Amino acid sequence: EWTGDARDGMFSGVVITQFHTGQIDNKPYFCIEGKQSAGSSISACSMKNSSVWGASFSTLYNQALYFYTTGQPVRIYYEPGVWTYPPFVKALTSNALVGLSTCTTSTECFGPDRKK
Amino acid sequence: EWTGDARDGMFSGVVITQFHTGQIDNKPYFCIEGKQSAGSSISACSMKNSSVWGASFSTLYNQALYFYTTGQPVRIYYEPGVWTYPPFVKALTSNALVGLSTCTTSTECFGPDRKK
Amino acid sequence: EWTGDARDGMFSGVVITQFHTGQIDNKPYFCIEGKQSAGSSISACSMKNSSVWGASFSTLYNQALYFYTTGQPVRIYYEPGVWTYPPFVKALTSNALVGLSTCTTSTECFGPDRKKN
Amino acid sequence: EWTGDARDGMFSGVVITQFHTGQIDNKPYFCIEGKQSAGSSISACSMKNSSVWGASFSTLYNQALYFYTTGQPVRIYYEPGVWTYPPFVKALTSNALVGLSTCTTSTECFGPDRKKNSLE
Amino acid sequence: EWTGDARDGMFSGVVITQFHTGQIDNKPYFCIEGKQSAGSSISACSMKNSSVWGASFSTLYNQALYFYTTGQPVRIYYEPGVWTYPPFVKALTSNALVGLSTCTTSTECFGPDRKKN
Ligand SMILES: [C]C(=O)[N][C]1[C](O[C][C][C][N-]=[N+]=[N-])O[C]([C][O])[C]([O])[C]1O[C]1O[C]([C][O])[C]([O])[C](O[C@@]2(C([O])=O)[C][C]([O])[C]([N]C(=O)[C][O])[C]([C]([O])[C]([O])[C][O])O2)[C]1[O]
Ligand SMILES: [C]C(=O)[N][C]1[C](O[C][C][C][N-]=[N+]=[N-])O[C]([C][O])[C]([O])[C]1O[C]1O[C]([C][O])[C]([O])[C](O[C@]2(C([O])=O)[C][C]([O])[C]([N]C(=O)[C][O])[C]([C]([O])[C]([O])[C][O])O2)[C]1[O]
Numbered sequence: 328e329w330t331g332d333a334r335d336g337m338f339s340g341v342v343i344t345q346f347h348t349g350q351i352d353n354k355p356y357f358c359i360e361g362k363q364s365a366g367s368s369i370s371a372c373s374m375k376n377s378s379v380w381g382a383s384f385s386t387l388y389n390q391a392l393y394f395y396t397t398g399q400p401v402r403i404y405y406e407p408g409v410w411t412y413p414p415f416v417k418a419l420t421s422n423a424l425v426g427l428s429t430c431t432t433s434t435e436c437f438g439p440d441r442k443k
Numbered sequence: 444e445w446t447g448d449a450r451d452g453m454f455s456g457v458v459i460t461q462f463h464t465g466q467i468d469n470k471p472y473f474c475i476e477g478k479q480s481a482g483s484s485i486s487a488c489s490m491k492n493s494s495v496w497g498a499s500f501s502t503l504y505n506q507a508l509y510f511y512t513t514g515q516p517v518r519i520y521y522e523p524g525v526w527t528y529p530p531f532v533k534a535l536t537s538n539a540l541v542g543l544s545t546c547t548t549s550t551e552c553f554g555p556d557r558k559k
Numbered sequence: 560e561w562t563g564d565a566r567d568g569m570f571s572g573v574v575i576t577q578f579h580t581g582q583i584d585n586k587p588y589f590c591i592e593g594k595q596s597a598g599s600s601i602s603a604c605s606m607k608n609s610s611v612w613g614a615s616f617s618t619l620y621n622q623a624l625y626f627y628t629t630g631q632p633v634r635i636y637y638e639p640g641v642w643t644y645p646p647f648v649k650a651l652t653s654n655a656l657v658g659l660s661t662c663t664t665s666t667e668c669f670g671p672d673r674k675k676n
Numbered sequence: 677e678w679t680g681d682a683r684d685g686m687f688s689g690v691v692i693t694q695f696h697t698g699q700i701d702n703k704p705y706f707c708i709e710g711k712q713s714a715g716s717s718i719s720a721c722s723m724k725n726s727s728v729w730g731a732s733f734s735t736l737y738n739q740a741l742y743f744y745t746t747g748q749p750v751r752i753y754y755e756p757g758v759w760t761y762p763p764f765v766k767a768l769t770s771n772a773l774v775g776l777s778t779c780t781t782s783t784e785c786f787g788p789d790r791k792k793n794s795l796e
Numbered sequence: 797e798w799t800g801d802a803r804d805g806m807f808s809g810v811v812i813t814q815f816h817t818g819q820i821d822n823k824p825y826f827c828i829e830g831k832q833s834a835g836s837s838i839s840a841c842s843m844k845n846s847s848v849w850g851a852s853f854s855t856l857y858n859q860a861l862y863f864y865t866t867g868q869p870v871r872i873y874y875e876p877g878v879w880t881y882p883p884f885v886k887a888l889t890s891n892a893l894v895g896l897s898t899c900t901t902s903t904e905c906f907g908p909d910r911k912k913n
């Protein structure tokens with residue numbers, strides 16, 4: 328697997344506006360929410376020692392909280408359909424957070440594309 | 444188990460006003476106290492390596508200290524009756540700290556409801 | 560053992576003014592000095608992987624450096640006679656740092672008391 | 677191996693301007709981009725438990741994010757040809773980040789040179 | 797072994813002005829450079845998992861970067877002759893960083909002396 332795999336998906340020029348941390352199945356997790364200037368919203372969660380993307384938890388939490396603090400427009404890389412516990416998906420999202428990037432414009436950000 | 448389980452409980456729109464850290468039974472712990480603008484108060488502790496909520500100790504420590512620093516209104520997810528050692532409950536609380544969220548309003552905060 | 564055991568002791572409303580880190584017997588340690596006002600000094604050190612209170616080293620380091628930075632009056636929970644290497648005690652203290660609390664006044668602080676009955 | 681080995685290479689007086697984090701093959705990684713005074717770019721990636729430079733991931737991540745925050749002109753030490761997965765190299769770089777230093781000038785920086793020797 | 801051992805040595809009232817991090821022999825390390833009021837210079841490196849002082853790497857990195865950020869005058873505790881790889885020593889120093897202290901004056905700092913007899 329790779330953050331820059333030709334898959335869904337990414338949202339660019341996102342300001343991280345909301346932050347939530349919790350626990351499920353003996354694993355700490357965090358979720359972020361971001362809004363583009365056009366009003367489009369994206370939610371993505373990361374879990375410690377989880378499925379495929381668990382190894383990134385520590386780095387993503389640090390980066391996400393950093394980006395929440397500065398308020399800078401960033402790129403959210405996500406993989407849909409990862410989290411499957413229905414009440415979790417309902418209240419939050421099925422999206423796993425798979426990467427983060429700084430942006431130069433609302434569409435142009437550092438690093439790989441993640442798109443079909 | 445999950446932060447968003449249909450149980451007690453959560454306080455929304457809380458400013459974290461007090462912070463305590465210590466050790467019991469070879470386990471580090473921290474407790475927070477927070478006030479809602481109505482002056483209503485909530486206490487919760489997180490303890491490393493404890494039974495159910497111990498896994499999220501360091502994540503919650505980092506996040507609670509972050510929120511204490513910013514002074515922003517947040518949501519405290521707790522579970523009552525977790526700590527049972529009487530002098531500990533008397534001095535602090537039985538409530539385990541179970542999650543944290545940023546809030547858009549005094550009652551509306553990011554993530555799941557923890558509601559019985 | 561517990562931070563809030565009815566034992567010696569605690570110093571409430573302390574501004575942490577001094578900070579030191581070193582190593583002894585393959586173990587990193589930090590130590591703090593602060594004044595009440597009042598005016599009296601308290602010193603306490605925490606040591607990684609130390610016998611009784613080693614579990615709290617990482618948390619207390621983080622919290623102590625935070626409180627040193629803000630300058631806010633805080634409570635120092637300590638256990639006397641923990642550190643025993645005589646030059647260490649002479650230059651620093653025998654006091655182990657066993658907990659920290661935020662304070663509302665110079666004596667009223669969040670969390671348990673640590674005092675003898 | 678050593679950061680100060682007589683090899684390619686180093687860029688001095690670099691301001692870290694871009695930051696990216698991700699995962700590949702079950703390993704977290706971060707990448708940085710920086711600009712020198714004239715606008716010339718250098719990219720370098722650090723990857724946890726990777727090749728020979730994997731041990732430095734945590735320190736480099738902390739230090740690079742620190743310098744990104746301050747906007748200090750810094751020395752980027754790098755080793756080309758380390759990352760070999762083609763889409764990764766194409767999107768980012770083959771350069772591994774192998775060191776960081778503060779700088780007193782745009783060209784004078786603390787610590788060793790990472791430089792090929794010249795021929796007499 | 798201890799930071800406050802009667803050995804070489806210490807520089808008091810230094811401002812940490814330069815910071816370097818890298819890797820040698822699969823070990824992450826960092827080095828600092830500090831200047832005293834008079835202009836006198838001191839360099840010291842801390843290396844993860846290396847020699848007797850390796851256990852302090854994380855604490856010392858955290859504390860040195862903190863002190864570099866504040867720019868406050870501090871005490872560098874060091875041990876000369878620890879690093880032996882000639883190109884490393886030439887480009888940086890043989891001195892291992894063994895401890896750090898806040899200072900009240902240019903000579904008076906918190907904690908032990910590290911002085912020869
Ligand atoms: C510029 C750019 O950006 N590009 C493009 C263009 O091209 C041109 C050429 C030049 N180049 N330079 N660089 O074109 C245009 C038309 O006019 C367009 O197409 C563009 O693109 C863009 O767009 C935008 C708006 O529409 C958007 O879409 C973008 O994308 C994204 C981002 O943001 O980035 C991508 C993707 O991934 C996403 N997602 C999906 O698809 C699913 O997941 C999208 C969306 O959806 C989101 O964001 C929400 O809104 O988008 C682009 O880039
Ligand atoms: C969120 C909100 O706002 N909700 C509600 C409403 O609904 C609407 C819908 C939603 N969505 N939107 N979009 O409605 C209204 C009228 O009807 C109201 O009711 C609201 O509610 C509220 O209220 C209040 C009072 O009355 C309160 O309750 C709140 O919250 C809480 C918080 O804080 O969060 C919830 C609960 O959970 C809690 N807790 C408990 O129960 C314990 O465990 C509460 C209280 O009690 C506390 O806080 C104390 O103070 O609250 C709500 O929400």
Ligand SMILES: [C]C(=O)[N][C]1[C](O[C][C][C][N-]=[N+]=[N-])O[C]([C][O])[C]([O])[C]1O[C]1O[C]([C][O])[C]([O])[C](O[C@]2(C([O])=O)[C][C]([O])[C]([N]C(=O)[C][O])[C]([C]([O])[C]([O])[C][O])O2)[C]1[O]
Nearest residue numbers: 683684685686687688689712716782783784789790791792
């Ligand atoms: C010192 C100096 O500066 N060096 C040199 C000189 O020398 C002088 C004498 C000795 N003594 N003192 N100390 O010389 C000159 C002529 O003759 C020259 O060569 C110099 O060099 C320089 O140059 C420049 C040009 O622009 C540059 O190159 C510099 O730097 C660098 C940095 O940045 O650091 C170095 C190197 O390493 C690099 N890299 C490479 O090569 C590969 O990697 C370079 C470049 O390329 C970059 O940066 C881009 O821009 O550069 C030098 O130093």
Ligand SMILES: [C]C(=O)[N][C]1[C](O[C][C][C][N-]=[N+]=[N-])O[C]([C][O])[C]([O])[C]1O[C]1O[C]([C][O])[C]([O])[C](O[C@]2(C([O])=O)[C][C]([O])[C]([N]C(=O)[C][O])[C]([C]([O])[C]([O])[C][O])O2)[C]1[O]
Nearest residue numbers: 804805806807808809832836837871902903904910911912
């Ligand atoms: C207190 C003090 O400071 N000391 C002294 C004095 O006092 C005496 C009395 C008793 N004590 N009190 N308690 O006196 C004076 C006049 O005589 C003097 O001597 C002093 O001393 C000082 O001096 C200075 C100049 O010379 C210096 O030396 C100082 O310090 C040091 C530091 O910095 O810390 C010390 C030592 O350790 C060092 N090092 C060595 O030796 C080797 O490592 C020194 C030097 O060398 C350096 O720094 C260079 O710069 O110094 C003293 O303290």
